[PDB]
Amino acid sequence: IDWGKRCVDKFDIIGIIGEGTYGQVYKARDKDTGEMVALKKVRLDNEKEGFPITAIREIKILRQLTHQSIINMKEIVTDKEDKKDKGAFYLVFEYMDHDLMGLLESGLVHFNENHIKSFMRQLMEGLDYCHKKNFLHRDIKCSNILLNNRGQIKLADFGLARLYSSEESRPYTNKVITLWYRPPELLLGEERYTPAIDVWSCGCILGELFTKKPIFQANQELAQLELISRICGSPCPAVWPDVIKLPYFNTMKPKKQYRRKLREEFVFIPAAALDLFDYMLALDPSKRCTAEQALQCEFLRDVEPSKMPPPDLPLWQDCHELWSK
Amino acid sequence: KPCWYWDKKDLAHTPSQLEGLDPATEARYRREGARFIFDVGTRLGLHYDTLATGIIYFHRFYMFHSFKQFPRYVTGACCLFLAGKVEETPKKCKDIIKTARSLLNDVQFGQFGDDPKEEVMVLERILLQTIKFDLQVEHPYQFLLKYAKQLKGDKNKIQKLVQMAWTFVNDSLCTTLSLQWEPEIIAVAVMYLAGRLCKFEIQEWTSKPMYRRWWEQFVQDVPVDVLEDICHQILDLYSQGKQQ
Numbered sequence: 001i002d003w004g005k006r007c008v009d010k011f012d013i014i015g016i017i018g019e020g021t022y023g024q025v026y027k028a029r030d031k032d033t034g035e036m037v038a039l040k041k042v043r044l045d046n047e048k049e050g051f052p053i054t055a056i057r058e059i060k061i062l063r064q065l066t067h068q069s070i071i072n073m074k075e076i077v078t079d080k081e082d083k084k085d086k087g088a089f090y091l092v093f094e095y096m097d098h099d100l101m102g103l104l105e106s107g108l109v110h111f112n113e114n115h116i117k118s119f120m121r122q123l124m125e126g127l128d129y130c131h132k133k134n135f136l137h138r139d140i141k142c143s144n145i146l147l148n149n150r151g152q153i154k155l156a157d158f159g160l161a162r163l164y165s166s167e168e169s170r171p172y173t174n175k176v177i178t179l180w181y182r183p184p185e186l187l188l189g190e191e192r193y194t195p196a197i198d199v200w201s202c203g204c205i206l207g208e209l210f211t212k213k214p215i216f217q218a219n220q221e222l223a224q225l226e227l228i229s230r231i232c233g234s235p236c237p238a239v240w241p242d243v244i245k246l247p248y249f250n251t252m253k254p255k256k257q258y259r260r261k262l263r264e265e266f267v268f269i270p271a272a273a274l275d276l277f278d279y280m281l282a283l284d285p286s287k288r289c290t291a292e293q294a295l296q297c298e299f300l301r302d303v304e305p306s307k308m309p310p311p312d313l314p315l316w317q318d319c320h321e322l323w324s325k
Numbered sequence: 326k327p328c329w330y331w332d333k334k335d336l337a338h339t340p341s342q343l344e345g346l347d348p349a350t351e352a353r354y355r356r357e358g359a360r361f362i363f364d365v366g367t368r369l370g371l372h373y374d375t376l377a378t379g380i381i382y383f384h385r386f387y388m389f390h391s392f393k394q395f396p397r398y399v400t401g402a403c404c405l406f407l408a409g410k411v412e413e414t415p416k417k418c419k420d421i422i423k424t425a426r427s428l429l430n431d432v433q434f435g436q437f438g439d440d441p442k443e444e445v446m447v448l449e450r451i452l453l454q455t456i457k458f459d460l461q462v463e464h465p466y467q468f469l470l471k472y473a474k475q476l477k478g479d480k481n482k483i484q485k486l487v488q489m490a491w492t493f494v495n496d497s498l499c500t501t502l503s504l505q506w507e508p509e510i511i512a513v514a515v516m517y518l519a520g521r522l523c524k525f526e527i528q529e530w531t532s533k534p535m536y537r538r539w540w541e542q543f544v545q546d547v548p549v550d551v552l553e554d555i556c557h558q559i560l561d562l563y564s565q566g567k568q569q
């Protein structure tokens with residue numbers, strides 16, 4: 001073990017990679033192992049409640065999840081030579097080279113069908129592992145899907161994850177997923193939801209790999225449900241009997257009653273992928289495929305990612321965003 | 326995954342005893358520390374799982390640190406503070422010190438020094454390193470309920486057995502039993518003791534009524550001598566109190 005005791009000097013910081021939910025995040029070089037890591041820094045006492053509960057939850061969850069497609073937290077180190085509130089903690093993760101959002105907005109890489117086959121296979125395998133354990137991610141999006149240069153997909157950002165009991169009657173937090181990846185039952189106020197919320201988010205990822213943009217881009221819940229209905233069909237009991245049991249079904253709805261145009265709006269997508277795509281964007285959560293069923297579908301069944309040449313990406317991440325204020 | 330279980334010989338060489346503290350005084354310090362966590366968290370309306378998690382942090386802490394170097398009530402307040410955050414029942418640290426101030430006299434509250442709050446905050450870093458960030462803990466309560474659900478001898482006598490076994494689990498937290506045996510074994514042991522004190526015969530209620538080894542259906546290869554020793558440690562807490 002030694003989880004928590006060794007010091008930060010045993011790592012060489014290379015630079016700041018970004019900002020997290022409870023402190024800065026550093027790219028760092030291990031002195032000895034020869035492997036690269038990312039360090040999520042945890043300052044304490046800046047908040048008068050000490051070690052942040054957001055880290056506790058992420059630490060507690062990541063120790064029970066170990067999978068090739070899940071972000072790997074290796075250990076926790078400290079500044080050392082503490083008494084002395086100066087000492088801070090650092091969560092050690094294996095370094096990943098890109099996130100899907102930065103990879104797509106660079107405009108520099110093109111994913112063909114086989115590339116998306118391998119990515120979704122790894123993503124659905126990792127999510128199935130989380131769903132056979134009793135964990136919901138509740139924050140899947142393009143920026144939380146990490147990718148290295150060996151072509152390996154890994155799921156990250158488990159801070160918002162929580163344990164669920166199957167078909168049990170216990171309530172949760174309603175506004176969990178970012179708006180562009182939030183399923184319709186959450187937009188209508190479902191609070192006792194299911195792992196289908198993660199599958200919807202992955203369905204948005206799949207369509208966003210064939211198109212270059214997110215498929216549902218709105219800035220408010222009312223408009224977001226409108227764009228979803230314009231493509232996936234309006235929520236109604238014919239396709240989704242339980243919409244009448246949802247808190248906001250009557251007070252927020254599209255102007256028109258839309259018919260499902262998903263196969264015509266995305267006709268350029270190959271048939272097998274469009275079949276999985278249609279399966280993942282079912283309005284009714286009970287009709288939405290599970291991660292297990294998604295692995296058994298035509299598009300992903302025979303995919304062995306370890307036997308496919310990875311697509312070549314920029315050796316580092318750079319969104320190449322035009323100067324804009 | 327770390328290892329969190331000691332034998333009777335290793336518990337006789339804790340850091341406190343190495344510094345000259347007698348076994349009786351450390352056992353008393355552990356009782357008062359566990360009961361302190363219990364009373365403070367009770368007055369704040371905390372889950373019994375949260376109380377048990379703070380107490381388990383407290384017992385493991387003093388397998389690596391000495392009571393002569395770390396005052397017990399400061400450590401207890403720190404363990405309850407971390408446990409509430411782990412068990413998703415957060416409580417502001419200001420509240421724990423306030424509640425601790427309400428139950429302790431000035432000589433006991435003197436352990437918090439001039440500024441009581443900072444003593445708990447700076448200790449949280451030490452506690453986390455000591456428990457090796459192994460935050461998830463399970464307790465005998467869930468197994469007592471799970472094992473009792475599979476008894477069918479008599480409804481009223483089962484509930485009396487569960488109720489006495491639940492009380493014995495609370496008493497167990499005042500000892501190092503959680504450092505000796507897995508929570509499943511503690512669950513079986515308190516049913517065994519409750520069955521003795523009630524003169525109920527638990528074997529009658531199993532699917533194998535003819536078979537005294539009624540517990541080998543729940544835990545594998547647990548000899549009766551282990552259960553007898555757990556009972557002896559628990560009844561030791563009743564050296565003064567009436568058993569029940």
Ligand SMILES: CN(C)CCCC(=O)Nc1ccc(C(=O)N2CCC[C@@H](Nc3ncc(Cl)c(-c4c[nH]c5ccccc45)n3)C2)cc1
Nearest residue numbers: 017018019025038093094095096097098099317318319321
């Ligand atoms: C306008 N658009 C949006 C951006 C343009 C500007 C632009 O180019 N940005 C930009 C963003 C990131 C990087 C970057 O250095 N990386 C890419 C991302 C994965 C990094 N490796 C990485 N590996 C493991 C983990 Cl757990 C995390 C991790 C877990 N949680 C985290 C929270 C925050 C940061 C990292 C993590 N991050 C590397 C470089 C440039």
